[PDB]
Design an enzyme around this catalytic site. Sequence first.
Site, PDB file in Angstrom:
ATOM      1  CD  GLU D 186      -2.719   1.234   2.518  1.00 18.45           C
ATOM      2  OE1 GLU D 186      -2.574   0.314   3.346  1.00 18.45           O
ATOM      3  OE2 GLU D 186      -3.477   2.208   2.710  1.00 18.45           O
ATOM      4  CE  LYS D 228      -5.824  -0.928   1.618  1.00 17.04           C
ATOM      5  NZ  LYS D 228      -5.898  -1.358   3.036  1.00 17.04           N
ATOM      6  CB  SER D 270     -12.200   5.015   0.793  1.00 18.28           C
ATOM      7  OG  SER D 270     -12.162   6.134   1.663  1.00 18.28           O
ATOM      8  N   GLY D 271      -9.649   6.713   0.672  1.00 13.13           N
ATOM      9  CA  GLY D 271      -8.769   7.865   0.755  1.00 13.13           C
ATOM     10  C   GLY D 271      -9.458   9.194   0.967  1.00 13.13           C
ATOM     11  CB  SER D 299      -8.799  -2.525  -0.039  1.00 15.86           C
ATOM     12  OG  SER D 299      -8.487  -2.790   1.313  1.00 15.86           O
TER      13      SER D 299
END
EC number: 4.1.2.13
Lengths: 343, 343, 343, 343
Positions: D186, D228, D270-271, D299
């Site tokens: 990620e 990710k 989503s962030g 995710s």
Amino acid sequence: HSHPALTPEQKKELSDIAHRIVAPGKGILAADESTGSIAKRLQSIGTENTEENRRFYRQLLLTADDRVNPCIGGVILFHETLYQKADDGRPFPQVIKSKGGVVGIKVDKGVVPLAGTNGETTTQGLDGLSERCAQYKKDGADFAKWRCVLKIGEHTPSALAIMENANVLARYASICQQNGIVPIVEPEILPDGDHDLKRCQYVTEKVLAAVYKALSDHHIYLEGTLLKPNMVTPGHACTQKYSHEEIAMATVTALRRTVPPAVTGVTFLSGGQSEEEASINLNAINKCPLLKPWALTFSYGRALQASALKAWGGKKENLKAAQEEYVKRALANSLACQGKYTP
Amino acid sequence: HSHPALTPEQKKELSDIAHRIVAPGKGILAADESTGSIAKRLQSIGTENTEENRRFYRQLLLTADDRVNPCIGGVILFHETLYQKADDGRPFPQVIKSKGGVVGIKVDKGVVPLAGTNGETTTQGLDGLSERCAQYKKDGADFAKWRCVLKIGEHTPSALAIMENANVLARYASICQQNGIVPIVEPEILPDGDHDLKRCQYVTEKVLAAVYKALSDHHIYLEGTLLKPNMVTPGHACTQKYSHEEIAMATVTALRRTVPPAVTGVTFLSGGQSEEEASINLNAINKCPLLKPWALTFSYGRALQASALKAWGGKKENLKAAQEEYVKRALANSLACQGKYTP
Amino acid sequence: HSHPALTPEQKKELSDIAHRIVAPGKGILAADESTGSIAKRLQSIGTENTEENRRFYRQLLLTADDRVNPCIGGVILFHETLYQKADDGRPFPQVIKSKGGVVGIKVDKGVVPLAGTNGETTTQGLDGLSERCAQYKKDGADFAKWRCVLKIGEHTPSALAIMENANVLARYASICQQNGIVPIVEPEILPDGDHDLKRCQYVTEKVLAAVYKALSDHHIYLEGTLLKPNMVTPGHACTQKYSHEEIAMATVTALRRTVPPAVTGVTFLSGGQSEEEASINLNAINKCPLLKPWALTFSYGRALQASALKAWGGKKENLKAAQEEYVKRALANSLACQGKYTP
Amino acid sequence: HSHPALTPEQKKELSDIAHRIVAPGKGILAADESTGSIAKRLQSIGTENTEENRRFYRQLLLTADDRVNPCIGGVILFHETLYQKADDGRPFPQVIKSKGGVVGIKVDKGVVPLAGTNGETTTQGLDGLSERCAQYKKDGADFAKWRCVLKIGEHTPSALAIMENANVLARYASICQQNGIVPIVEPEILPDGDHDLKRCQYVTEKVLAAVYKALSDHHIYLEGTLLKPNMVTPGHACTQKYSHEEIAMATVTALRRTVPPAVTGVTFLSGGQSEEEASINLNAINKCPLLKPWALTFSYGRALQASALKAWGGKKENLKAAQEEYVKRALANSLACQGKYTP
């Protein structure tokens, strides 16, 4: 596994050549200026650039008085100047080696832009360099010169420009050391822009660290090389003023954090400075109260010959006086590389 | 763009601590041995490894005669030894600093294998290192120790192992320099195997170059660090024999091509040598007729204390004689770091 | 900060040129052989190497039947062949573009040895490449070719050779993409030696990863480039035997772990294979039951023209039959790049 | 020379675990939130953060209706949540694996600042990771999670931060793959600041290229890993507005230029987006008309559970309705990873 790039005899001859160049009291005259640069310096004085005028000007530079014999240990020439003769009949390599000098030659082919960057360039001249260096070795040249250009800007020098210039410098130095020619690494950082001593020192340390990592990657024999950096100085547009010993402390500090002591000598640039401040700054560098385990001397193109060129005037009868101008500067810079200079 | 990792006061205190450690005539005693290592050295003499025996042995080491005061400038301890007291009531940091020593601590967590390689390991101990270093700074420790392990083999050290160990060393040194603790970089290369001076010198030069490139990448203040390399020596299984001055020339040559002179001192390993050859080789290094712009001294774990441990015998009444053994070696190594040693 | 190396119109024209080269069913004929290579292939058949014989042989290759029009999408030429005319009067760029081909040119200057390594070479030809690429762009050439040589040995390919060749390839590709010429990256690894599929796959993955990291460092537009790798095959001296689908699985596996899917096509080498095994292996690659998000086709120098050269015999009246030989191989390789080939 | 990090059985089990996670239609629920993050999300609704409330909230998340069985293929947990039991008596690994899920765990120890940079951090948690991963492997966890933080600023992300985070990610992934645990890389780049699609795409391409070069350097098996990343989106303070298909084109374009197709799946963040725009952007990514040779799925930590948390209200009797909220979002994101979603 270890495969030696150089036999011990090659390491020995490279070591003694590099020791003969930066011998105590001696420095380098840089007469390596190509046709456009010498053309614009001849148009500034008002002389049309032809072959006889260039031969006569480098005759004025090279056939000077013998008081510059413990002043100049090496002379960088152009490709054309190696095959030009003096009026006495001696070729200019013989004219240099007659009084204790070492013949050099500029071997790069200029700068070429790097795509994707902001006005950053790399340098050119790697093709056929082995045959050219062998030919220059037969013609009496014992060292070479290669110039990289880096500028301090808003996000420059980037990682790509520093990495590429260090890689090309190490490739050049390997090719030169294979032929028995001492390479002079010149990672020049441009004094253009508005930046203090701090950012110039930071950029100089990063550039010199990447250069010496590239030299260690390419199996370069560091005792048979020379370094040609700049002095750590503020930009031209920077408004803050600095003492000469502050510039000297910044320069010796940026050198001591990067340069390993196996490198034989350090010959500084003039880099757009005026003719007296180069000797002032070099003198202040040589009285910096730190431990400096290498030769600190000069490699001055313009700061050795600007007054001699302007007092020449393009006519022959001024010659000796023009030569006389050059002689003072040479002796001055000799004291500047010994710390004994006083204006 | 330049964001300073350290203020000038932090640079000043790191510089004077690192200058106090490698002061002329002084060296480092390495009592940093963890429970398994001191356990096997206590089972070799025949003493069962308990806490009182370790406290008493480090009491024997640290409370020696005051003739070692201009011999030992720094002592590396374990985490346990910082919180142990002598029988007089003073804690061991106070027992070291009472006679001019500087307290250190081993801060790594051992070695962990690298997958995909042939028996190559990296090192451990980065988590929580800021809080631990702040705590050790309150406990009187002014420097740290961190050990990397590299071995010469058929295709080892690979690029992955050298790159990873240099990166972890630079990360460690940044974390230590943030807290006012001088880091000691130890890129130890194992003397196991059959290899000459040539391959060990080659591997040492490549490893030290990658280490100092990683230190320049991580904005390490090189004046507030120390280097802990090995001596360039052949392998244990190598059949060729070498003079001591040959080993010294190879060691000073591999150091001069990589280490910049801003680094304050170089403290060598013993590295499985016997107790007299460490002083012989260190003495021969300090009479090498090259220009060495840093402090060359010792950091000897086993080669300071092997005779003192064996003459101790595990019983208390031998103590002073055991201490007396240690005293000779300390003074011997002091002369070995001044070039004045003669066996 | 982002400074675009290419405007979107430049990216568009590079994308459509690279799409026109590796169009489905099409491949590349490599007639780029220099004077020594074509000289030794003409001395093997027994013809003395002169200019008319080379012009006539490339006339035999290029003026073939029009059944190769959906077979050959691109032709790599020499510098000399661009300025040679057919007997009809058309220049060879016009002779290629008349039937749907794209003109290419080999632009490197050979290999030069790397000092300090064991028989490892880098490649040459960067000086003046911008002016040469602009000139070839005016002469009708839309793509280029540049060949790197790497060999598998006892400790080769080293890190220096892979790093230097990837850097020179990325510099070449940047210079070509500035002038509107699609670069074809060819990191050829030599099939000499005794090594299995495992070591060749390992070396191919490391080389391709370093090449694509160098391409990302130099801001290369990956949609306007082509890749010219080898097939993952054992060495010539390796005693173990492998199925064709094993070679295909190793090749597609080494490609899928390194090559990003933005690259437009992959054109394989022949690489010393015989003329039928190239089509067998390329056919087996195109039926590998993995997901292959790019064009898999051929770039065959010798495996397209060996039978045509040998059935030519150096005399003119065999011409058509010689051409006929070439035609079969072209159509065969077309089926080999579509997976529909059956011997 | 090739020393395999993994036997073919290890490669097989890593491949089938990574294939079971990103199976078509399935995605990842991220319940990995530590005590401070779940504490502030519980103080936003007005519930005091205690152990029973966290166990009950993750009970609400994990014991939902069985319509999420072809929606959620994997669940990332905290270290505490692995050893918590449901009220039925089953532990949460059994509660996940009962309905076709794969158990994961967050294994990093947070972020730690990098000295010399401008607010750039690296990440922590490498010590003892082998023993912890073996223990989590015995507890039913088959994959892991590790998060790096990078921010776009005036000269950030620098080379040091990208290099260090890629190196730590590759070291983590090697340690996880040694123990039979699929690593999820990620490299999250923060959406803070004012920057367009162009600079975010540039930064994402540079970061992903350095990450995959570090993975190739550390011998990572790319078929047994997951990626990710974020979606390529403008900053929060950026005034320019962009269509969803523009964001999707930028995201698929930045992925296709870096990610090799051996990587099994890509699960987006989503962030900080709102709960509907994540499904809109993921749906638009899955209808991008390019060739995407990997699994594109979700995710989502906050964008799966924000409405379920807010409709929970901290009291038990709302539970089913809260669960019902979550169910819609899960099914919506399932359609968003199949391109069949329509709001």
